[PDB]
Amino acid sequence: DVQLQESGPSLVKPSQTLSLTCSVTGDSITSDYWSWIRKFPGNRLEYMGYVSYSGSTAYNPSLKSRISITRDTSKNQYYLDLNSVTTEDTATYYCANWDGDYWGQGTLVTVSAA
Amino acid sequence: KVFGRCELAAAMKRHGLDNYRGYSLGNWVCAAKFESNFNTQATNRNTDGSTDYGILQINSRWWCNDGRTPGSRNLCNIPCSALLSSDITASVNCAKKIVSDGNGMNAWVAWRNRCKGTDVQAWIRGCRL
Amino acid sequence: DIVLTQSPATLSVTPGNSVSLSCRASQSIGNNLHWYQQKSHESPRLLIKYASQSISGIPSRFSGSGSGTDFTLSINSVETEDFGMYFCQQSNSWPYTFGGGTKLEIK
Numbered sequence: 001d002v003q004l005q006e007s008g009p010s011l012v013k014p015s016q017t018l019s020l021t022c023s024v025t026g027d028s029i030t031s032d033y034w035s036w037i038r039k040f041p042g043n044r045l046e047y048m049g050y051v052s053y054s055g056s057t058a059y060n061p062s063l064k065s066r067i068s069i070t071r072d073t074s075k076n077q078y079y080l081d082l083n084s085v086t087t088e089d090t091a092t093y094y095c096a097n098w099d100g101d102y103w104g105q106g107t108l109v110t111v112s113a114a
Numbered sequence: 115k116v117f118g119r120c121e122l123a124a125a126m127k128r129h130g131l132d133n134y135r136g137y138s139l140g141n142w143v144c145a146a147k148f149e150s151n152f153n154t155q156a157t158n159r160n161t162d163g164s165t166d167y168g169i170l171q172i173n174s175r176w177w178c179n180d181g182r183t184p185g186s187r188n189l190c191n192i193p194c195s196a197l198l199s200s201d202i203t204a205s206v207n208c209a210k211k212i213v214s215d216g217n218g219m220n221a222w223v224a225w226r227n228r229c230k231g232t233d234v235q236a237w238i239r240g241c242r243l
Numbered sequence: 244d245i246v247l248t249q250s251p252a253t254l255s256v257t258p259g260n261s262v263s264l265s266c267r268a269s270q271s272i273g274n275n276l277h278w279y280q281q282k283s284h285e286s287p288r289l290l291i292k293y294a295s296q297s298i299s300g301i302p303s304r305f306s307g308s309g310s311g312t313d314f315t316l317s318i319n320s321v322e323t324e325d326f327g328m329y330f331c332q333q334s335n336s337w338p339y340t341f342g343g344g345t346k347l348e349i350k
């Protein structure tokens with residue numbers, strides 16, 4: 001069966017680029033649509049975007065184009081790059097397939113100057 | 115099952131295809147018209163060993179699994195036989211995923227050749243929706 | 244952007260009773276409305292697909308209905324495992340959007 005898992009730094013600083021990787025086990029990433037969703041400190045969910053089987057992407061305009069979702073067939077993973085982050089991007093990030101049947105565990109990423 | 119133009123238009127609206135991802139309802143009826151002539155049991159064997167299934171001729175090489183297609187991917191995570199029902203639920207679900215790719219409705223060759231750039235709304239005109 | 248409003252923000256119920264959670268779209272979205280359940284320290288779980296389609300592996304007590312702009316998620320006879328957050332989400336138009344969520348707590 002299919003399983004997803006988020007990995008990457010949990011603490012980043014302002015203006016830097018936050019990157020997370022989602023490892024997919026059980027089937028090829030080329031066989032589905034993949035996305036990124038995050039939950040803000042107040043139970044606010046935001047659909048960040050997804051990458052289709054073709055490599056085409058859909059990004060939430062709310063990210064003002066600071067987001068990029070790519071994938072690596074050889075490693076069977078897909079990534080999320082969020083540039084120029086601020087404490088506003090402090091949230092719990094999740095990767096899940098487009099259908100929403102498979103989700104990762106979710107990983108908290110705090111944007112802090114400290 | 116062979117739908118009537120208005121019958122399919124009403125069912126497709128009911129299955130939320132009206133204005134889904136920027137495509138008007140007429141695009142879907144016209145597409146079904148030229149892809150399968152409104153026939154839910156229509157099938158076509160392609161040269162690459164893949165088969166197009168259902169009202170919307172969904173391909174067995176990328177979208178559904180019929181257990182008989184080489185480089186199959188089953189992007190719709192569903193058996194091709196599920197797209198051959200008189201119930202268009204599965205076909206609509208899969209089609210929505212197909213269209214959510216950057217190529218949009220251009221994935222439907224018949225739609226490309228006969229509907230795109232055409233007055234598609236005419237296909238739902240004169241119908242009780 | 245399509246906006247989803249969920250009511251009530253919080254709902255208190257006694258295990259065994261039934262409840263209905265509301266979700267309204269600022270604009271029509273046909274049947275493209277999905278329901279998710281989320282418990283603390285857990286990713287969201289899909290309960291209902293496209294307004295009323297059931298999902299394999301989900302309890303039968305969960306059901307959904309509605310079309311256009313008015314949708315509901317019903318839980319016939321709430322169980323303890325049903326306490327947590329419930330969010331609706333639309334895929335009709337990009338960007339996909341979620342409702343503020345309704346919290347279900349034990350009475």
